[PDB]
């Protein structure tokens, strides 16, 4: 199957309280492998998966140095943006950046991406062609023209189609047992009568990796998202994931209702009507 | 492996 490597960066300004909060995090698929926090003890990029600790001193020195530069640009960016939108110095604002690459099941380059947010909404992004930019408003138009003139896209392209996919492959083979595993969801099925005329059916899917899963509720083939309560996929905290789906059922009908689980751990997309 | 050439906005 596909794999990805993504890096997430977050800078938050702290008016009156000094330098911004900087938090950086790296993922391969749904596995955090590295972290940096400006408030933590070490002042270094730090391991978060077993298979990345085997990297030597050079690796961590450069990662640390790079992420310190990412911190440094974002600290300056908060001051630029505040200037750009003429906002006061009293407020706390947020910068977010996300970059990385997808590879196919052959492990060749599939997609690269690099986006940027200011206060939680789109500021600037690389388009899929890895050559041009979408700037979200008139202030970001400035940044686009600046970055077009300074050939930023070409530099990014080299990373995204090159280094990004090279290092992903190294990670995917260094953590084979960790990252190339697939854990099928343990299913479970609960029913509690709410009130006399009404019952709730609830479909569980637990202990699964990776996080992408689909549960749908359905009568006679026709799927029912009119009654459906679907929670967000949530971390168990051991490396796997959890999700539930529910419906509001008129009781005495719970044989013609079916729950539909699919996940890449499943050879067959599972059905579970109530016992 | 992170990106080695981050620039300003």
């Amino acid at each position, epitope marked *: 199957g596909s794999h990805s490597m993504r890096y997430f960066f977050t800078s938050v300004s702290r008016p009156g309280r000094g330098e911004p909060r900087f938090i950086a995090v790296g993922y391969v698929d749904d596995t955090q492998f590295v972290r940096f926090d400006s408030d933590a003890a070490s002042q270094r990029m730090e391991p978060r998966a077993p298979w990345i600790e085997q990297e030597g001193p*050079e*690796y961590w020195d*450069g990662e640390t*140095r*790079k992420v*310190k*530069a990412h911190s*440094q*640009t974002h600290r*300056v960016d908060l001051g630029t943006l505040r200037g750009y939108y003429n906002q006061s110095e009293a407020g706390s604002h947020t910068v977010q950046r996300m970059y990385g690459c997808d590879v196919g099941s052959d492990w060749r380059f599939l997609r690269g991406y690099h986006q940027y947010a200011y206060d939680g909404k789109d500021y600037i992004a690389l388009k899929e062609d890895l050559r041009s930019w979408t700037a979200a408003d008139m202030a970001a138009q400035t940044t686009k023209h600046k970055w077009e*003139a*300074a*050939h*930023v896209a*070409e*530099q990014l*392209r*080299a*990373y995204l*189609e*090159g*280094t990004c996919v*090279e290092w992903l492959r190294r990670y995917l083979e260094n953590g084979k047992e960790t990252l190339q595993r697939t854990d099928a969801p343990k299913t479970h099925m609960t029913h509690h009568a709410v009130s006399d005329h009404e019952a709730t059916l609830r479909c569980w899917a637990l202990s699964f990796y990776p996080a992408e899963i689909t549960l749908t509720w359905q009568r006679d083939g026709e799927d029912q998202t009119q009654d459906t309560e679907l929670v967000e996929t949530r971390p168990a905290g051991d490396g796997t994931f959890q999700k539930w789906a529910a419906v509001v059922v008129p009781s005495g009908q719970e044989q013609r209702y079916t729950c539909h689980v699919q996940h890449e751990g499943l050879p067959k997309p599972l059905t579970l009507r109530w016992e | *492996l992170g990106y*080695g*050439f*981050v*620039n*300003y906005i």
Partner: T-cell receptor
Amino acid sequence: KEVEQNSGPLSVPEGAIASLNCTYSDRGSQSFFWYRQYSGKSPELIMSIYSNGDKEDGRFTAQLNKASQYVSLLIRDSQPSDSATYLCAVTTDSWGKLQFGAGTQVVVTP
Amino acid sequence: NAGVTQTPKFQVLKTGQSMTLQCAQDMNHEYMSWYRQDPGMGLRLIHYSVGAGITDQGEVPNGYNVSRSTTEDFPLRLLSAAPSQTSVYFCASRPGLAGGRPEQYFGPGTRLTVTE
């Protein structure tokens, strides 16, 4: 010795091809350069390469092989004024030191 | 459009004399470096600076002194000259975080001779 370069000197007659190599020793390296330094003056930059494969500018071609950790430079159709020493430079990031090889002295004979 | 300039081209000193090597740059670059070059052992890094106001040492700092008040200028000071400071000195500049293509351009160099 971070960046290992071609010993030298390297004598090539005019119209021929000078191939230069260097090897670097940090896998995380993301930037690759060739400098030309004439005797008694400053290194001038002639070729930058950022991704695997070939970049061509004029009579120069640089190749990159990130797997083998190998940067090279071919000079087709030599002039006697290509005679100089050629340094490869390698870096990891904007804040990483630029790592220089010792340089290969290339002499083009008429 | 003038790139890296530096001053002077040539220099002779007695042991113990002071001099300062001027170095300037045109391109709003943050990262500037000072090197020496010597016949037997290549380009060697003396001091460098990744922005205005701040500097750090390289692999051969000893006896050389540096500051960076403004982003444009990166002067190198030799307070008391030693006969082993005889060398070609090259100033250099990269964008750092500022810029475009991350190429480091060199200045034309200063050839310095120190004699007893």
